[PDB]
Amino acid sequence: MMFEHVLFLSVYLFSIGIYGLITSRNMVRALICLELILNSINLNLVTFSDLFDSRQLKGDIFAIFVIALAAAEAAIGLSILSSIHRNRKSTRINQSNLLN
Amino acid sequence: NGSFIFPECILIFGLILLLMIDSTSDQKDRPWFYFISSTSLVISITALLFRWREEPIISFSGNFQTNNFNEIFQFLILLCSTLCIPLSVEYIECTEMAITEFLLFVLTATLGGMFLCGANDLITIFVAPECFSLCSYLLSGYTKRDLRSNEATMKYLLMGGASSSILVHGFSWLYGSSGGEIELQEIVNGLINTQMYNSPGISIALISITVGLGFKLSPAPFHQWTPDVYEGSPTPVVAFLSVTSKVAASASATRILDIPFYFSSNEWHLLLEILAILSMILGNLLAITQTSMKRMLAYSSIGQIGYVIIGIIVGDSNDGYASMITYMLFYISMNLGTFACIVLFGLRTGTDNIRDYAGLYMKDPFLALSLALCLLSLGGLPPLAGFFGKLYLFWCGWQAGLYFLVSIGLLTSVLSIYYYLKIIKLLMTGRNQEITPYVRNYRRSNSIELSMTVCVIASTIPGISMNPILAIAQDTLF
Amino acid sequence: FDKGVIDGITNGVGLASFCIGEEIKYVGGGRISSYLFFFLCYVSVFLF
Amino acid sequence: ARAALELHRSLCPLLVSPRELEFLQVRDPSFCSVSMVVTQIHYTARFPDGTVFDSSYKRGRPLTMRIGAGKILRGLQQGIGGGGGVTPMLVGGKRKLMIPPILAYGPEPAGCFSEAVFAQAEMNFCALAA
Amino acid sequence: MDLPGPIHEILMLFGEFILLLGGLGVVLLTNPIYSAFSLGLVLVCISLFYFLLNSYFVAVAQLLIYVGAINVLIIFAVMFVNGSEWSKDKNYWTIGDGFTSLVCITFVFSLMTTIPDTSWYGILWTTRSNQIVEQGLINNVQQIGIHLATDFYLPFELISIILLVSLIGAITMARQ
Amino acid sequence: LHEYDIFWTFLIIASLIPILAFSISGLLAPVSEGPEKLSSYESGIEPMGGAWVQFRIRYYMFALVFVVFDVETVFLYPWAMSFDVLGVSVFIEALIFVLILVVGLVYAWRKGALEW
Amino acid sequence: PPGTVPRWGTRSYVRERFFEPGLTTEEAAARIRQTAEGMRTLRPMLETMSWKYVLFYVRLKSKYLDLDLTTAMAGVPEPRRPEYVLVANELVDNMTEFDRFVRTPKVYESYLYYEKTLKSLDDVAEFLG
């Protein structure tokens, strides 16, 4: 059930990754769930590049690039978090709607 | 070992120079790099001038692209950046922020947009949207002491992460169902030797791609992120986004939807239509009720105007792409003109809301005139350029059968005339006891003047001189 | 039956927009969670 | 899913020449060979007796593939780029093939809740380069 | 290379059941530090999923670049969000909880019924030449090693400037 | 790259080791210590209370620059493995790669980021 | 020469064998005979060391021929069928060892059994029909 049971867990993570995103209240939790979604897509990707495409790996390289960009985004978002917590002394996300 | 990146290798050279000068030089930079970056941009434009009338030759190991149609957009993004930088020099100058890394960010985002215009690789066309988005949450929030510039980083980063996520998940579904393939051309083969094409699957990897595409250029059902960010970020980066993001997204969309999606036409031609019919409606109604200038521009010039561009992507038998190129060339100018005028007046006064533009015709008439011209052009009135743009967009698009999209377009254009004429009316007035003490103290009076005046006549002349532009835009096969 | 009917119609065609705009403009309105919710609803329904 | 409708002709050929591996048949060689590079052909695939299950004409631009690196049915890559004992097809050439079931998908179908190809089939082609 | 035998599905189900609880801990627990630690658990148990399938690099790297740098960075970040212990009891927040737990389940149902209709074990037979090469004599750190630089030249040349720009932006933003 | 069965057995054994040790300690242990047991080591009589002890302002920059400069290595490893296998083009490519981040580190050094 | 009968592929191995319950006698007699001319196509893929399909195909064809051989053999001529059961032992131990000599990839034993695994399977199906 290798090729079949893992994909059955991709969605069962991806979905959760979205839900925690929407119902998130603090910035760090939203970023965590974002990273979780990216890892879900990564996992949905890799298995495809193990059943087939073994002559020239086309998924593992793409997985590497996805992880690199995930790290970059997780750096930039937290950097923005620093400045927002500097401006206002609380990072409650859903209590800032002064741009509407 | 290849000159098809040299148009971007020059940009990389200029980037490295801009990063070096701050490391080495002390203080001689402020007006120096202001033109040293323009040197790199104009040199890249000259380099792209060479590859006019060239072959569809494939890239490094067949990675990004090199044909005529893609080269058009590759030059167009450079044009946008060249016009935009002089705006986003003096603005951030009059904020006491570091200017070096701002120009570095703008240059790197332009580089990402330039690479995106090709990218027939399924991976390059994923990193390049990130090279264009990772350099966007920075600019769109690069005024830290402000408060709104943080809201328009939260509700831009979260959204642009979720959407790129959905897009790459669609890409993974495609890579799976396609028996394993990345090269954009080589999918309809590989999706056949693996006989899983007509099956469910592909139907999912089409929607999970079209949604991530839409978010990047914001039609109606996903427009939610645009009105906020365009108000929260500084006006120059608003203009830069609202021109080059749309250009790059519309350059990537046609290729990612026409090359690997021969068969699914009747199932995405409809889909995009559902977006367009909404994009040119919900992006106009709200535009009426606005009172802020940047937010009204977000609604009108983007929320709607990203309608009739698409209005031929659905109705395209390669007899229309010329009209898309022409309308993009018109829209870039007719949008950068009004953004230049808005930046200039806002800096000179210190307000954004509409109710302060009163009497501006009497204090300084040149700026009022050069703003009214661009606004009317956006309205699409006969002697101007937007009229001929919308016209040749409809005349090829009514010539392709579909009727319940041209009528809605004309109707929403008539509707859009309203707020344009509203602000125009607010310009021409002389009721001295009405004008607020903002235009009353206006010492009327280089770069921004030059940009505004050479960008506004291109909003009146090409609409009447579209013959060579049309003759040029017909040679696009991609 | 001129001001009260056909003038009424030619204004209500230009007045109903003034109401619909502000009406649909006051849903959501910030609260990024609501943005993402309304962004997911359309993605989900479009799968049909 | 399974077979659908179509309509065409065939421009009746001469007798096929198997050449010990497949079924080869030539209709019109015109201009020039093709190396291990991207090509662009137009196909119309049959079943063994009469049925037609796909045709490049049933879509827009005829599909583009790679002739020289294994990315397609071994039968085709032998009968388009030129196999052992067979001359390759010219730029504007035109040939006709009957693919035996060993140089094809083999004795197992491609299912999608309904196999889109009869299990252990052997199909026909009318391949015209472009 | 290959796997032991019928011990495979045992580890498969074990890791799946661990990862489900991990995700539920990520999304349910209110104390953010517990959430981050459960996220680390999720990521190590998915690195083990990557390692089970015979893809070695994309497993160990994923373990180094995420279960390391990113998690400690997030731990440092949670030292800036004060105020925890919100409400509880069966969708603590507003009815938005129910609306999400509805639309997400619709999304699930859609994809989770789309998947078990494609014969993956039949989509593997139609490609018997892709994973039939191995280049003649190679191991799986040289496969990636070369095929990253022989045809994936442009994105590899590109990612570096993305990293540099991200560094510069992060330093310019986080610093007051 | 032939048999990681030893790896899996070592994983399960060394993961059972800590819980085994904890349980063995728990079996032969005292059911005692109902004392205060609510305060930790080296504390001023019952000191209790306090928060906002972070100083994340300094160490956060270190964490960020490390997270960014780490990705270099997992890209260098496929290159460091494929030097002689391929020609010398990968040498120049990886030189450009590393030099980009050398310039980045020079920048992070000049402008004050790595501090006390 | 018309089309053929798919005959219950159609699933994702969680729909089949778990959720679409059905297997009639003389229908497993199709799977049994199919994995004979089926498993006789890996010879080229054992020539070149493609150690990644010679495991997936064997696992699938086994888990398919590890239930049919228990259903089909109940439906052969029951008066005289101890041999039709004295063959399943061989036709499912040769493969149980084939699965050993692919896990730690060998060549000599792998190929020495990739002939003595099909040589038997042509005799299990033989007692059927």
Nearest to C26 by CA among E84, B286, D57, D40: B286
- Mark which residues 39-98 of A lie under 8 Å from E by CB: 39, 42-43, 46-47, 49-57, 60-61, 63-65, 67-72, 74-76, 78-83, 85-86, 90-92
State how far residue A41 is from chain B, nearest Cα, in angstroms: 6
CATH number of the domain where residue A23 is located: 1.10.287.3510
How close B232 comes to chain D (CA, Å)?
45
Q: Is position D63 within any domain? A: yes
Contact A78 F64 (CB under 8 A): yes
Choose the mutation target among B63, B114, B133 for the interface with E, i.e. most E CBs under 10 Å: B63
Cβ proximity of B251 and B271 under 8 Å = no
d(CA E117, CA D113) in angstroms, rounded, equals 6
Q: How far is C-alpha E118 from the geometric centre of its chain's CA atoms?
A: 24
- Give the nearest partner residue to G9 out of D2, D3, D109, using CB atoms: D109
Which residues constitute the domain of residue D118?
Answer: 26-129
Q: What is the dihedral of CA B307, B309, B311, B316, to 10 degrees?
A: -160
Closest to E115 measured CA to CA, from F58, B177, B326? B177
Name the residue of chain G whose CA is nearest to F3's CA.
G104
- Whole-angstrom distance, CA of residue A81 vs CA of residue B413: 41
Amino acid present at B85: I
Chains that touch A (3 or more CB pairs under 8 A): B, C, E, F, G
3-class SS of residue E169: helix
Identify the burial level of B196 via C-beta atoms within 10 angstroms of its C-beta, where 0-12 means exposed, 13-18 middle and 19 or more buried. buried
Instruction: Kindly report the CATH number assigned to the domain that includes residue D74.
Output: 3.10.50.40
Decide if E137 touches D, using CB distance below 8 A. Answer: no
B419 closest CA partner among B304, B273, B314? B304
Helices B124-133 and B246-258, packing angle to 10 deg: 160
CA distance C25 to chain E (A): 20
Q: Which of A 16-45 lie inside 8 A of C, CB atoms?
A: 18, 21-25
Rounded to a whole number of angstroms, the distance from the CA of B205 to the nearest CA of chain D is 16
CA distance B63 to B109: 20
Which residues, in sequence order, are CB contacts of E165 under 8 Å at separation 6+? Answer: B104, B105, B108, B134, B135, B138
Flag whether residue D50 sits within 8 Å of chain B, measured between CB atoms. no
E110, C33: Cβ pair inside 8 Å?
no
**Domains of chain E by residue range:** 6-174
Tell me whether strands D124-129 and D52-55 are parallel, antiparallel or unpaired: unpaired
Find the CB nearest E126 among D71, D74, D105.
D105
Verify whether the Cβ–Cβ distance D48 to G10 is below 8 Å.
Answer: no
- Asked if residue B375 lies in contact with residue B423, where contact means CB atoms within 8 angstroms, the answer is yes
- Give residue numbers after which chain B breaks (C–N above 2.5 Å): 445
Beta-carbon separation of C37 and E107 below 8 A: no
Closest-CA distance of chain F to residue A65, Å: 10
Q: Which residues of D touch E125 (CB under 8 A)?
A: 105-106, 108, 110
- Exposure string over E25-46, b if 16+ CB within 10 A, otherwise e: bbbeeeebeebbbbbbbbbbbb
> How many CB atoms are located within 10 Å of the residue D100 CB?
13
Which of G7, G12, G42 should one mutate to test binding to chain E, selecting the residue with the greatest count of E CBs within 10 A? G12
* Cα separation of the two ends of chain G: 23
Question: Which residues on chain F are in Cβ contact (under 8 Å) with B23?
Answer: 106-107, 110
Nearest CA in chain D to G38: D107
CA–CA gap between residue E99 and residue E91 (Å, rounded): 11
**From chain G, which residues contact F within 8 Å (Cβ)?**
103-105
| Residue among B367, B377, B375, B352 nearest B425 (CA) | B375
Pure H helices in B148-259: 148-177, 202-217, 225-232, 235-240, 246-258
Give C36's contacts in chain B (Cβ within 8 Å): 158-159, 162
Token readout for B387 is 């009229």
Q: Do A74 and E159 touch (CB under 8 A)?
A: no
D109: chain E residues, CB-CB within 8 Å: 122
**Chains contacting F (3+ CB pairs below 8 angstroms):** A, B, E, G
F110 — contact with chain B (CB < 8 Å)?
yes
CB B306 within 8 A of CB B218: yes
Tally the domains of chain D: 1
Identity of residue B44: S
Using alpha carbons, select from B130, B137, B129, B77 the residue that is nearest to residue B107. Answer: B77
Question: Are residues D63 and B198, on separate chains, in Cβ contact within 8 Å?
Answer: no
Residue E3 at interface with chain G, using a CB cutoff of 8 Å: yes
Are C36 and B162 in contact, with CB atoms under 8 Å apart?
Answer: yes
Three-state secondary structure string covering B117-132: CCCCCCCHHHHHHHHH
Task: Pick from B19, B24, B26, B104 the residue to mutate for testing the F interface (most F CBs within 10 Å).
Answer: B19
- The dihedral sign for the CA sequence B218, B221, B224, B225: negative
- Report long-range pairs for B472-477 (Cβ below 8 Å, ≥24 apart): B473/B72, B473/B321, B473/B322, B473/B323, B473/B325, B473/B326, B474/B322, B475/B68, B476/B68, B476/B69, B476/B72, B476/B318, B476/B321, B476/B322, B476/B325, B477/B56, B477/B67, B477/B68, B477/B69, B477/B318
HEC string of G17-33 equals CCCCCCCCCCCHHHHHH
CB contact under 8 A, E65 and F71: yes
For chain B, say whether D63 makes contact (Cβ under 8 Å).
yes
Using a CB-CB cut-off of 8 Å, the residues of chain D touching G35 are none
Interchain contact C/F (3 or more Cβ pairs less than 8 Å):
no
Q: Residues of A with CB below 8 A from F68's CB? A: 71-72, 75
Q: In the structure encoding, which two tokens stand for residue B157, read together?
A: 């980063």
Residues 412-451 of B with CB under 8 A from C: 415
Say how far apart CA F33 and CA B162 lie, in whole Å.
Answer: 51
Residue numbers in A near F101 (CB within 8 A)? none
Size of interface F-G (CB pairs under 8 A): 4
What architecture is the E6-174 domain classified under in CATH? Answer: Up-down Bundle (1.20)
| Cα(B49)–Cα(B54) distance, integer angstroms | 11
Q: Which helix (H) or strand (E) holds B43?
A: helix B33-50
On whether the CB atoms of residues B44 and B70 are closer than 8 A, the answer is no
Q: How many domains does chain A have?
A: 1
Token representation of residue A36:
């979780």
What own/partner pairs with CB < 8 Å and gap ≥ 24 does E147-151 have?
A: E147/A56, E147/A57, E147/A61, E148/A61, E148/A64, E148/F78, E148/F79, E148/F82, E149/F78, E149/F79, E149/F82, E149/F86, E149/F89, E149/F90, E149/F93, E150/B61, E150/F86, E151/A56, E151/B61, E151/B63
Question: Which F positions 67-96 lie with beta carbon below 8 A of chain B?
Answer: 89
CA B142/CA B231 separation, integer angstroms: 13
Chain B residues with CB under 8 Å of A27 CB are 154
* Beta-carbon count within 10 A of D18 CB: 11
- Chain E contact present for B101, CB below 8 A: yes
- How far is B301 from B242, CA to CA, in rounded Å? 8
Q: DSSP character for C6?
A: I
**Could you list the residue range(s) of the whole structural domain that residue A34 is in?**
1-87
**Determination technique used:** cryo-EM
CB B38 within 8 A of CB B82: yes
Write the secondary structure of chain D as one string of H (helix), E (strand) and C (coil): CCCCCCCCCCCCCCCCECCCCCEECEEECCCCCCCCEEEEEECEEECCCCCEEEEHHHCCCCCEEEECCCCCCHHHHHHCCCCCCCCCCCCCCEEEEECCCCCCCCCCCCCCCCCCCCCCCCCEEEEEEC
